[PDB]
C-alpha cells in the first residue's frame, strides 16, 4: 500500500481524463476554464464528469460539494483537500 | 488479634503528631507494615477455629475478609488524594483519622464472638461512613443520600437487636460455639417465623436485596472514592459475613419460610442487570453490578450447601476487589474531566494509552474471566442452585449474558472509538494511578493461582 | 455555576408559559416543541422527537461530534442511549417490514414442517442387522459377568 | 516413556516465552515478529515428532499434576491428554498459524502498533491449544472463554469504526450463549457423576441424557456459528484479514464441534440427540449455502462457505462417524487458511476494495495468487482425488448409507451443488473476467514472505491431505459397498453444479436488466434474519428497560412506596400535631376530657 | 439539511436522484459496458421530457421517479472504501491523534525533536498573535444579530488569517 | 409501480416518498429558515468557544447536562400515580415474581414427592 | 516411593517392535540422541543434588491422634465432652472424603489403562466404587451446611428406624 | 514497601505454609487406612458410622 501523490501529476490525470471524454473540445480546454459558462455543456453531463472522477480516484465526493466544482482547477483543489496532497 | 487491634489504635495519633507534608509517607508506610502483620494471621487449621482473648476467634469466613480489610486500608489511604490536597490541614488530618477509626470498628466487627458485640460494631461501622460521604461527597444530593443511607440501615437492622436479646435470655450466652453445640431446632409456629424474618430482613436490608436497593446507588455515586470503596466492598461483604454467621440457628424452618426471597432475589438480579444496561453516569453501573452480585450471594446463602458457601465467600472477596478497582478507574476518569456523565468522555484508547490495559483487565474480571475468582464463585453458586432446582439455570445464564453485555458496553462506549476533540485538558496518566491499578490487580491474580486459601469453613 | 432554571420541572400547561419557555430554553421552534403529553409516567416536560435519527442524518453535513451525529445544541432525544450507531439500525429496508417477517416465518415453518415429515419417514438401504456373534456382544456390554449368558447366535444363510 | 511427555510439554511451554519477552522488554524490538515466527516454527517441528510416535506405535497418554481447590469429593488439577484427536489436531493448527504469522508480517507491516497485535494473536493460539489438549472439562471452559475474549480483542483491533466493536459485541454475546449451554452440561455432569473428568463420564453409561447433551447442542450452535445463532460470522469478517483467517479457519470455530467429537463414546448412544445433530446441521448447511449466493464481498462469501462446511460436520456427527469429521476439520483448516490468505493478499494488492465488483481481471496479473485461488476452489467440492476429496466425499458416502432422516441427505446434496456454484462464481468474477478495477495500478507481489506462505500452504493442500488420510488409525467401520448413483453422486452433483453456474454466467453476459423477484432479495438480504433479529431483540429489551426497569419499577415505585409513604405520613402527623393555635382554654379542655375518658370509658382505676 | 442553504432546491433534488440511480445501476450491472448501455438508456429517459417547465408536472414526474427508483434499487450498493458504510470508513481513526496534544511530553523527549517543536512554537505564536482583535471584531461586526448562515467571511480587510482556522487547518493526514 | 412502502416502528420512512416534502407551504419554508437560524447561532457560539486558545477545560455542553438531569432524577417530580401508571407498575413488578414463585413451588413439590417415593436416581449424587 | 498395595499397578505388558522395515527407523536415532542429550546431564545434576541431600538429613512425622470415645457417651449439654467428640467426628469426615478421592483416582487410572475397551477389566473397581458411594450417600449426604455431628446422628436414627419398620412390615 | 517486601513476601508466605485445613495429613491418613481396610478383609467405608448397638430407638 504505497501510492505516491503530488500536485502536478494529479493535475495531469484530471486534465487527461477530461481530455479523453469526447463531447468537449480539446482546443479551448484550459487548466482553469469553466464547465457550464464557456464549454456550454449542461448540468447532467457535468455530474457524469464528477462520476468519472469518483470512479477513477476511489472515493465518493458528496452532493453538498458536487454543486461547486465547475472547472478543473477547483477539482484539483478539492481532491488535494481529500488526500492531503502536499509534501 | 489484640496485637492486630492495638497498633491500629496507635496508628491514629500518628497523623496528629506528624507535621505537614510528612503525614502522608508515615500513614502509608505504617499501614502497609500493618498489612504484613495482618497477613501473618493465617494459622488456621483443620478441626477448630482459632479462638482467644475470649471475645475473639477466627474462621476462614473471617481470615480472608479480615486480610481484605487490612489490605484495602492503605490502598485507599493512598487513593484519596488529588481531591483534598487543596483542602486544609485540619480537615485533611480529620479525614485520615476518621478512616482509621472506621477500620478499627470494621476489624472489631469481623472478629466478634458475641453477636451483641457484633451488632454494636456493626452500627459503629455505619456511623463514620455517613460523615465521610456527607462532608466530602462533591455533589449536591449527597445530603439526601446520607439521610436515606442511615435510616435504611438502622431501621432494617434495629429489630435484629431485639431478636438477639430474646435469644440471649431464652437460651443462654451468645458465644458462636455455644450458639453452636447447643442449638435446639425451633419449630414452625408464627413467632419463630417472625424471629427468622426479623434477622433475615435486617441483613436483607444490608446486602441489599432487590426491594430495598435504592439505598445504595445514590450513596455510591455521591461519595468520595474512599467512602465509595469501603462502602461497596467492605460494607456489603460485611453484611454477607454476618448472614453466614447468624444462619446457623433456625435451620428447620428456613426451608419452609425462605422461598419468596429466592424469587425476589433472582428476578431482581435480572432487573438490576437490565437497568445497568441503559443508564448514563458511568459511576452508577458499578453500583448496580454490586447489586447483581449481592443478589446472587443471597441466593447462595438461602440455599445451604457447602458448595454454595464456598462459592459465596469467593464471590464476596472477588467482587469486593473488582468493584473497588473499577470505582477507582471511574474516579480517575472523573478527575480527568469534571463531568460524572458518560458520553462526554469518549475516546481514551489513544490518549492515556496503558489506561486501556487496566480497563480491559478490570472489565474482564467483571466478565468472569475464565480462570478468575469471580468465575469460580459464580460457577459454584450456579452448580449448587441447579442441585437446589433443575430450572433455575435460565435466570443464571441470562444473568451471565446481560452481565457480559453491560461489561462490554462499559468497555467499548466509555473508552472506544473517537476522542471528542474539544477537550484539551486530559494529561498523561500519573504514576499513582498506575500504582493503584497494580495494587488492585496483583492480589486477584495471585489468588487466581492458589485459591484454596479463601474458600469457606465448609471446606 | 449553573442556573436551576435551565432544568425542566413541571408539565407543559399552560399554552403561553411553557411553550414560550421551552422554545427559548430548548432552542427549537415554538410549535415543534411537542411534549409527551402528561401520560403521568414522569417524563417531565421534555420534547417528543421522531425517534429514529441516527442512521439518518447524512454524514456529509460535517457537524461537531463525528459519530454521535450531534450538533452541540439540540433537544438531546430522550431514548438516545437506545439509538447511537452500533445499537439499532432504523434505516429503511429495501422491501417492507411485514413482507420481510412473512417470508422469514414462512421459511422457518416450512423447514421445521419438512423436518417433522422427515422424522416420521426415515431412510434405510436394504440392510440386515449388524450381526454380533457373542450373544450380541455380551460380556463386552455394560456387565453381567456370570449372571445370565442368554443364548442368541447368528445362522449362516 | 520420558520422550513423549517431555516433548508435548515443551511444545506447550515454547508457546510461553514471547509473552515473557515483551514483559522483560522495556525496548522497541524491531524483530519481535521474527522472534515469534521462529519460535512458532520451532514449536511445530518439535510437535510433529510425537505425532509420528503416536502413529508408529501409540503409547497414548494423559498427564496431570498440580491439583488445586480439591474441596469436596472431587479434585481438579492441570490435566490434559494426548490421544487421537488431541494428537493429530495440533500440528495442522501450528502449520496454519505459522503461515498466518508470515502473512501478517507482510499484510500488517505498515502499522506502528504491530507488537500488541502479535502478543494478542499468540495468546489466542495458546488458548486454543489449551482447549484442544485438555481432558478435565473445567480447563475446556477456560479455553472456551479465553478464545472468546481473544476473538473480541482481535475483531475490535481497529478501534474506531462502529462496525468493528458492533461485531465484537455480537461475537461475545453468542459466545455467552455457548457459555450458558456449557454450564448446563457441567451442572448435570457434576450432580450426576461426581465430577467433570472425561474418563469417568466415559466410564459410566448415563441414560437420561436429554438435558446435558442438549446443553452441548446449545454450546455447538453458540460457538461454531450455526443456525439461529450463525449470522455473527460476516460481521466477524468485517475485521482484519489474518485475524479473520485464523479466527474462522481452524481456531475458535471448530470448538463448537470439537467438543462433540470429544464426547464420541457418549454420542454413540441416545439416538434422539443425533437426530437433533443432523437436523441442525442440514438446516445450517442449506441456509448458509442459500445465503452464500448473491453476495458482492469476498470474505462474507468465504465465511458462508466455512459455515456450510461446519454444517457438514454437524451432519457427520449426526451420523455415527466422528473420525471422518475430524478429517474434515484438518483438510478444511489447510484449505481455507490458504484461501483467505491468498484473497486478502489480492485485497492488499488492490487498494482496500475487497468487493467482487471493481475487482474484475486478475488472471496473468501475476498468476501465483490466481493459481492459488483456483487450487483452493477446486479443492472445494473435492476433485477426484485430492486433499479436498477425502473429507466431503467420505462424508456424503457414509451419510448416504445410513439410517438418516430423508430430508437431511437431500439438503446436504443440494448444498453440495450450491457450494459448487458459488465457488464457480468466485472464480469467474475474481480471476477470469474482463478487467474492471480502477487505474493507477500497483500490482506487486515481489515478496519472499508471501510466496513462502502461499507456496508452503499449497504444498500442504496438495499432498498433506493424503499424508493425513492415508495412515489414520482406523477408528470406525467403512461402508465401502455402494450401489451405482450413490458413489457417482458426488462427482455428478459437482459437475452439474459447475455447468449450472457456467450457464448462469453466460446468461449474465447478456443485456436484459431484469427486475429483482424477491428470491434474489431473500438470498441477498441474509435471509432477513440478521436484519429482523438485530433490529428487534435490541429494541424490545430496551423498551422493556426504559419504562420497566429504570423509569418505572426501581426509581418511581420503590421511592413512592418506601420513602414517600412513610415520609408523607410522618409529615402529615406533624402538621396535625404541632399546628396548635396558642390558646389555653383548648389545652385545659383536652386535660378535662382526658380525665373523664380515662375514668369512665377506658378504665385505669381497676 | 445542509450548511449554506436552508433547504435544497428541486433541481438539486432531481440531480441527487440522478446520481443515486446511476450509482445503483453501477452496482447492479457488471461488465461495465452493458452498464454504459443501460446508463445511456437512463439518460435517454431523462431526455424524454427534459425541456418542459410545468413545475407541477415536473414534481409529479419526480414522485413517480422516486417510486420507480425504490422499486428496482439494489440491496448492497457498491460504496467506495472511504464512504459512509464503506470498507474502511475512517480505518486509521485509530492513528489520528489530535494536535492540541503532543505538548504534554517530557523535555528530554522534547529535546529529541528540536526543529519541529521550534516551528511549532512559532505556529502557536502565529495563533495567539492574531486571535483576538481581527477575528473577534470581524465576527462581532460583519454578522447580523441573527447570523442566518454559517459560511464565515475571509479576512479580506487588511492582514492576517481568515477567522477561526485552528481546528480546520490543523486536521491530521487521514493516512498516517 | 410499487406497493408504496408502509413504514413501521423500525422501518423508517426515507425522505423521498414522504410525500409531505411536495406540498410546501409558507410556514414550511419559514420553519426551515428559522431552523437554519437556530443551527447557525448554536454553531456560532460553539465555534467561538471551540477555537479559543485560552480554553482549558471542556466546552461545557449545556444540553447534555440538561438531558442528564432529565433522565436521572427529574423523573419523580413530576409524577402522580394514575390508573395507567399503577396498573403497569403492579403488572411489571409482582407478575413475573409470582410466576417464578409458582414454577419454583411446582418443581420443588415434584422433587420432594419423587424423593419421598424412595426411587430418586441417587445412584451417586454426592455434591448436593 | 509409594505404597503399591493401595495403588494397585496391574501387570505390565510391552511388545518388542520387529522390523521388517527398511526406511529405517526415525525413532531409534531420535531416542539415542534424546538419551545422550537429555537423560545423562539431568541425571548428573540430580545425583549432585542427592549428594547434597545426603550431606545432612531431616525427618518429618505423621501427626498421629488418639481415640477420644464417643458422642453417644456425652450428656445433654456438656460442651467439653462434645468438643472432643465432634472434632473426632470432623477428622473422620475429612479422611472419609479423602477415601472417596482415592477410589475416584483408582477409577480414573483403570479407565485410562484399558483405553478403548472400557467395559471389561474395570468391573471390580466400579463395584467397590458403588459400594463406597452407597455408604457415603446413605451416611453423610443430605445434612446441608451446619454439620456439627448431631445432625448426622439424627439422620442415623432416622435411617435405621426406617429400616426397622421396613423389616417389620416385611418380616 | 508495597511490592518488594509486601506482595512478594506475602506470595512466599502463602506459597508454602502448613497443610492448610489439614490436607496432606488427610492424604497420608487415608492411605494408611485404605491399606489397612483392604489388607484385613474388612469392607472399605462401612456404613452406620455410629454402632447401632449403642442406640435405643423409640418403639410402638
Ligand atoms: C419484623 C418484626 C420482628 C419483631 C421481633 C421478632 C419476635 O420476637 O417476634 C415474636 C414476638 C412475640 O413472640 P415471642 O418471641 O414472645 O414467642 C412466644 C413465646 N412465648 C409463648 C413463650 C411468649 O412478637 C413480636 O415481636 C410482635 C410482632
Ligand atoms: C435470549 C436473550 C437475549 C437478550 C439480548 C439483549 C441484547 C441487548 C443489546 C443488543 C445490542 O447490543 O444490539 C446491537 C447489535 C446491532 O447489530 P447490527 O444492527 O446487526 O449491526 C450491523 C452493523 N450496522 O445487535 C446485537 O448485538 C443483537 C444480539 C444478537 C441477537 C441475540 C438473540 C438471538 C436469538 C434469540 C432467540 C431466538
Ligand atoms: C423495610 C425497611 C424500610 C425503611 C424505610 C425508612 C423510611 C424511608 C426513608 C427514610 C428517609 C426519608 C427522607 O429522607 O425523606 C425526606 C424528607 C425530607 O424531605 P425535604 O422536603 O427535602 O426536607 C427538607 C429538610 N427536611 O424527610 C422526612 O420526611 C423525614 C420523615 C421521618 C422519617 C423517619 C424514618 C421513619 C420513621 C417511622 C416511624 C413509624
From Swiss-Prot, chain B:
From its record, what is one biological process in GO terms? mitochondrial electron transport, NADH to ubiquinone
Q: Tell me the compartments it is located in.
A: Mitochondrion inner membrane
What start and end residues bound the annotated signal peptide? none
Q: What is its EC number?
A: 7.1.1.2
Record field: transmembrane: 22-42, 60-80, 98-118, 147-167, 196-216, 224-244, 256-276, 284-303, 308-330, 351-371, 391-411
Q: Which GO terms describe its molecular function?
A: NADH dehydrogenase (ubiquinone) activity; ubiquinone binding
Q: What InterPro entries does the record tag this protein with?
A: NADH4_N (IPR000260), NADH_Q_OxRdtase_chainM/4 (IPR010227), NADH_UbQ_OxRdtase (IPR003918), ND/Mrp_TM (IPR001750)
Catalyzed reactions per annotation:
a ubiquinone + NADH + 5 H(+)(in) = a ubiquinol + NAD(+) + 4 H(+)(out)
Family (UniProt): Belongs to the complex I subunit 4 family.
Designated name of the protein: NADH-ubiquinone oxidoreductase chain 4
Tell me the gene name: MT-ND4
UniProtKB/Swiss-Prot annotation, chain D:
Per UniProt, what is one GO molecular function of this protein?
NADH dehydrogenase (ubiquinone) activity
Its subunit composition reads:
Core subunit of respiratory chain NADH dehydrogenase (Complex I) which is composed of 45 different subunits.
What name does the UniProt record give this protein? NADH-ubiquinone oxidoreductase chain 5
Q: Which family does it belong to?
A: Belongs to the complex I subunit 5 family.
- GO CC field: mitochondrial inner membrane; respiratory chain complex I
Task performed by this protein: Core subunit of the mitochondrial membrane respiratory chain NADH dehydrogenase (Complex I) which catalyzes electron transfer from NADH through the respiratory chain, using ubiquinone as an electron acceptor. Essential for the catalytic activity and assembly of complex I.
In terms of Pfam families, this protein maps to: NADH5_C (PF06455), Proton_antipo_M (PF00361), Proton_antipo_N (PF00662)
Report the membrane topology from the UniProt record. Answer: Multi-pass membrane protein
TM annotation in the entry: 4-24, 43-63, 84-104, 114-134, 140-160, 171-191, 213-233, 241-261, 272-292, 301-320, 325-347, 366-386, 413-433, 457-477, 485-505, 582-602
DNA repair as a keyword? no
Question: Chief location of this protein?
Answer: mitochondrion
